Design a protein around this motif. Sequence first.
Motif, mmCIF file in Angstrom:
data_model
loop_
_atom_site.group_PDB
_atom_site.id
_atom_site.type_symbol
_atom_site.label_atom_id
_atom_site.label_comp_id
_atom_site.label_asym_id
_atom_site.label_seq_id
_atom_site.Cartn_x
_atom_site.Cartn_y
_atom_site.Cartn_z
ATOM 1 N N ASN A 56 0.818 -1.208 0.000
ATOM 2 C CA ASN A 56 0.000 0.000 0.000
ATOM 3 C C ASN A 56 0.855 1.263 0.000
ATOM 4 O OD1 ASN A 56 -2.838 1.256 0.457
ATOM 5 N ND2 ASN A 56 -1.529 2.236 1.983
ATOM 6 N N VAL A 57 0.458 2.225 -0.828
ATOM 7 C CA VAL A 57 1.210 3.449 -1.078
ATOM 8 C C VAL A 57 0.350 4.632 -0.644
ATOM 9 C CG1 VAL A 57 2.375 4.810 -2.828
ATOM 10 C CG2 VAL A 57 2.366 2.316 -3.018
ATOM 11 N N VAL A 58 0.900 5.507 0.191
ATOM 12 C CA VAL A 58 0.152 6.666 0.671
ATOM 13 C C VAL A 58 0.457 7.842 -0.251
ATOM 14 C CG1 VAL A 58 -0.333 8.183 2.620
ATOM 15 C CG2 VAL A 58 0.229 5.786 3.025
ATOM 16 N N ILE A 59 -0.597 8.396 -0.859
ATOM 17 C CA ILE A 59 -0.515 9.534 -1.774
ATOM 18 C C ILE A 59 -1.151 10.734 -1.092
ATOM 19 C CG2 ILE A 59 -1.064 10.421 -4.084
ATOM 20 C CD1 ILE A 59 0.679 7.946 -4.096
ATOM 21 N N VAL A 102 2.070 24.893 3.002
ATOM 22 C CA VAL A 102 3.310 24.400 2.412
ATOM 23 C C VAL A 102 3.626 23.027 2.998
ATOM 24 C CG1 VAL A 102 5.762 24.845 2.041
ATOM 25 C CG2 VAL A 102 4.122 26.778 2.135
ATOM 26 N N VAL A 103 3.826 22.039 2.122
ATOM 27 C CA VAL A 103 4.267 20.712 2.543
ATOM 28 C C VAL A 103 5.700 20.793 3.043
ATOM 29 C CG1 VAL A 103 4.801 18.381 1.742
ATOM 30 C CG2 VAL A 103 2.692 19.511 0.987
ATOM 31 N N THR A 104 5.969 20.160 4.183
ATOM 32 C CA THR A 104 7.298 20.051 4.757
ATOM 33 C C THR A 104 7.727 18.593 4.824
ATOM 34 O OG1 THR A 104 6.530 19.858 7.043
ATOM 35 C CG2 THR A 104 6.922 22.095 6.192
ATOM 36 N N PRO A 105 9.035 18.335 4.872
ATOM 37 C CA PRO A 105 9.495 16.967 5.141
ATOM 38 C C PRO A 105 8.904 16.375 6.407
ATOM 39 C CG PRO A 105 11.310 18.291 4.341
ATOM 40 C CD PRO A 105 10.142 19.233 4.492
ATOM 41 N N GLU A 106 8.799 17.158 7.487
ATOM 42 C CA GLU A 106 8.229 16.632 8.726
ATOM 43 C C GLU A 106 6.776 16.217 8.536
ATOM 44 O OE1 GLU A 106 9.868 19.383 8.374
ATOM 45 O OE2 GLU A 106 11.571 19.409 9.768
ATOM 46 N N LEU A 114 5.416 15.010 5.712
ATOM 47 C CA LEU A 114 5.439 13.710 5.048
ATOM 48 C C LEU A 114 5.739 12.594 6.037
ATOM 49 C CD1 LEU A 114 7.301 14.519 1.757
ATOM 50 C CD2 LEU A 114 4.846 14.637 2.253
ATOM 51 N N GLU A 115 6.682 12.829 6.948
ATOM 52 C CA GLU A 115 7.051 11.816 7.924
ATOM 53 C C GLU A 115 5.919 11.562 8.912
ATOM 54 O OE1 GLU A 115 9.689 9.940 7.936
ATOM 55 O OE2 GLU A 115 9.402 9.001 9.911
ATOM 56 N N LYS A 116 5.246 12.625 9.366
ATOM 57 C CA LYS A 116 4.174 12.473 10.347
ATOM 58 C C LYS A 116 3.035 11.618 9.802
ATOM 59 C CE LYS A 116 1.065 15.345 13.276
ATOM 60 N NZ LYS A 116 -0.270 14.696 13.056
ATOM 61 N N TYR A 117 2.668 11.814 8.537
ATOM 62 C CA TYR A 117 1.533 11.113 7.950
ATOM 63 C C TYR A 117 1.953 9.944 7.062
ATOM 64 C CZ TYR A 117 -1.167 14.875 9.917
ATOM 65 O OH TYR A 117 -1.743 15.757 10.794
ATOM 66 N N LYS A 118 3.232 9.564 7.094
ATOM 67 C CA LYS A 118 3.734 8.378 6.392
ATOM 68 C C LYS A 118 3.402 8.439 4.908
ATOM 69 C CE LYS A 118 4.789 7.411 10.493
ATOM 70 N NZ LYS A 118 5.996 8.157 10.958
ATOM 71 N N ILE A 119 3.540 9.629 4.333
ATOM 72 C CA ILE A 119 3.198 9.870 2.936
ATOM 73 C C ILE A 119 4.360 9.438 2.055
ATOM 74 C CG2 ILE A 119 2.845 11.693 1.219
ATOM 75 C CD1 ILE A 119 1.389 13.186 3.621
ATOM 76 N N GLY A 137 12.274 11.697 -5.205
ATOM 77 C CA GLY A 137 11.431 10.702 -5.837
ATOM 78 C C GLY A 137 10.018 10.643 -5.298
ATOM 79 N N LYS A 138 9.568 11.683 -4.598
ATOM 80 C CA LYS A 138 8.248 11.693 -3.976
ATOM 81 C C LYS A 138 7.253 12.588 -4.708
ATOM 82 C CE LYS A 138 10.165 10.661 0.589
ATOM 83 N NZ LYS A 138 10.041 9.187 0.382
ATOM 84 N N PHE A 139 7.613 13.107 -5.878
ATOM 85 C CA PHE A 139 6.738 13.975 -6.658
ATOM 86 C C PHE A 139 6.124 13.171 -7.794
ATOM 87 C CE2 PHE A 139 5.481 18.240 -8.113
ATOM 88 C CZ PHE A 139 5.145 17.995 -9.438
ATOM 89 N N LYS A 140 4.791 13.174 -7.882
ATOM 90 C CA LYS A 140 4.083 12.511 -8.974
ATOM 91 C C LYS A 140 3.216 13.533 -9.687
ATOM 92 C CE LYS A 140 4.250 8.370 -9.521
ATOM 93 N NZ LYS A 140 5.145 7.758 -10.553
ATOM 94 N N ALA A 141 3.500 13.764 -10.960
ATOM 95 C CA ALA A 141 2.714 14.688 -11.765
ATOM 96 C C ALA A 141 1.485 13.973 -12.317
ATOM 97 C CB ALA A 141 3.555 15.266 -12.904
#
Lengths: 131, 131
Positions: free
Chosen positions: A2-5, A78-82, A84-89, A105-109
């Motif tokens: 499972n992948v979190v988007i 604004v998205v921050t690294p923290e 992404l880490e908090k919500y396991k994105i 590698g975390k950007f999907k267009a």
Amino acid sequence: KNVVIYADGVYDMLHLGHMKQLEQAKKLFENTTLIVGVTSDNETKLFKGQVVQTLEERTETLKHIRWVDEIISPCPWVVTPEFLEKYKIDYVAHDDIYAWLKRAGKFKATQRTEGVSTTDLIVRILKNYED
Amino acid sequence: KNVVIYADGVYDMLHLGHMKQLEQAKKLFENTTLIVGVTSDNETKLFKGQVVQTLEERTETLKHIRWVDEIISPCPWVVTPEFLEKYKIDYVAHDDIYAWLKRAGKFKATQRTEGVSTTDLIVRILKNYED
């Protein structure tokens, strides 16, 4: 598997264009959880200039959309690294400020989408009454 | 255990009011399949007087709604006993022509819902520009 988007936006006056963008984010991989962030009224007004629907209305509308698994409302502007880490994105879906996501590698267009907007509807209706 | 629910409508310019009605139909029982029928352009024009969005647009919008499991598009204007039998429908959800459904125990009333319509949005926007 499972992948979190994560996708964020104002989602003011939601229409098919928004819905198709959410569908694309949801279908980026075979098994996903699509988290959608809805921007606050005050930050939307401050940074975009205006907003028609309240946070409650914009969020309640998204609750009814098939592709949306979870909602963060309000979300950070604004998205921050923290974050992404908090919500396991794993990926951020988007239709520069995002270079750091691409370097990771975390950007999907997602591909550009069109819909029948409130504007399109009004214009179509009025064409019956005046040229 | 699974219960097949049928709801039909024009679903022109779908908004939260429609979405909440579909949610109620979907949640009438613990395990449901909600089938939604979308009326044809010609019958809608003939019997209601007008329609803004095409069958394709109205159906494509409903595809994105969480509660909708299956769509019949176009659907018949009038539900018949043979139609219920063909699609194995257990209940018809509705917000007289339907007395036969009530006599059979197949009529389920949903509570009235309100939403923020295209009209509500335009009025809210224009209030910023004129009294």
